[PDB]
Amino acid sequence: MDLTINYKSTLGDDVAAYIYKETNKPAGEWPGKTMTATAGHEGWYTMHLTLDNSTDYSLILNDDGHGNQLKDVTLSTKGKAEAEYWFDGSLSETKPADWKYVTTIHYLASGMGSTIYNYMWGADASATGAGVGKEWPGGQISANADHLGWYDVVYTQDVKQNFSCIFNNNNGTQTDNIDVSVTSTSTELWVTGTKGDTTVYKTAPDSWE
């Protein structure tokens, strides 16, 4: 299942989430997984994880191995398909009012030129991003500066609504329909291939350098 934890740090700018159940440590050995500064939310840090929903887990927020940790709290994840938590004085599953759902999708363009488009449909009316309110081929998207051959598109919504999109070059090359499941306020996906050969990754693939 897709886990997301946001923490308004009270332990400094270097923090991690340690998760455990019966000696299972899905976020890694102590101190766990480092939480990255949350985009668009000063003071917050965020980590994502895939874990086995066969069980609940315990969470220990800490300063990433530098001697300080908060008291354990239970993540009642058993049987759930997804879960996003906010920790700001206490554990919450309620999105803060000012937060949006920001979905980032990376596409690896190979031998289809340097002008790439993203066509999008099915999102909430509040949606903003390259392809909103645009008929085929959609909106043109820029290249990822740090990753060669990749292009990025970001769709922001006020509500947690799934949608679909297609990457293309407006010249006969396009992906399969990409069905985007929004599982958190900072959902990230990686896409490769074209029609018949489109693959969607929920964690960065080896192709992501």
Ligand X SMILES: OC[C@H]1O[C@H](O[C@H]2[C@H](O)[C@@H](O)[C@@H](O[C@H]3[C@H](O)[C@@H](O)[C@@H](O[C@H]4[C@H](O)[C@@H](O)[C@@H](O)O[C@@H]4CO)O[C@@H]3CO)O[C@@H]2CO)[C@H](O)[C@@H](O)[C@@H]1O
Ligand Y SMILES: OC[C@H]1O[C@H](O[C@H]2[C@H](O)[C@@H](O)[C@@H](O[C@H]3[C@H](O)[C@@H](O)[C@@H](O)O[C@@H]3CO)O[C@@H]2CO)[C@H](O)[C@@H](O)[C@@H]1O
What is the DSSP pairing of strand 82-87 with strand 73-75? unpaired
Token pair belonging to 25: 């440590």
Nearer to ligand Y, 102 or 120 (CB): 120
71 binds ligand X (CB under 6 A): no
**What whole-number distance in Å separates Cα of residue 187 and Cα of residue 105?**
8
Asked if residue 96 lies in contact with residue 72, where contact means CB atoms within 8 angstroms, the answer is no
Task: Determine how many CB atoms are found less than 10 A away from the CB of residue 137.
Answer: 19
Give the one entry of ligand Y, ligand X, none that residue 20 binds, where binding means its C-beta sits below a cut-off of 5 to 8 angstroms depending on kind.
Answer: ligand X
- Residue 153 beta carbon to ligand Y: minimum distance, rounded to whole angstroms: 15
**What whole-number distance in Å separates Cα of residue 201 and Cα of residue 189?**
6
Give the closest residue to 166 by CA, choosing from 137, 187, 190: 137
List 141, 166, 178, 180, residue binding ligand Y (CB under 6 A): 166
Nearer to ligand Y, 175 or 183 (CB): 175
List 58, 92, 171, 177, residue binding ligand Y (CB under 6 A): 177
- Residue 120 beta carbon to ligand Y: minimum distance, rounded to whole angstroms: 9
30 binds ligand X (CB under 6 A): yes
Nearer to ligand Y, 96 or 136 (CB): 136
Q: Return residues touching ligand X (CB under 6 A).
A: 20, 22-23, 30, 60, 69
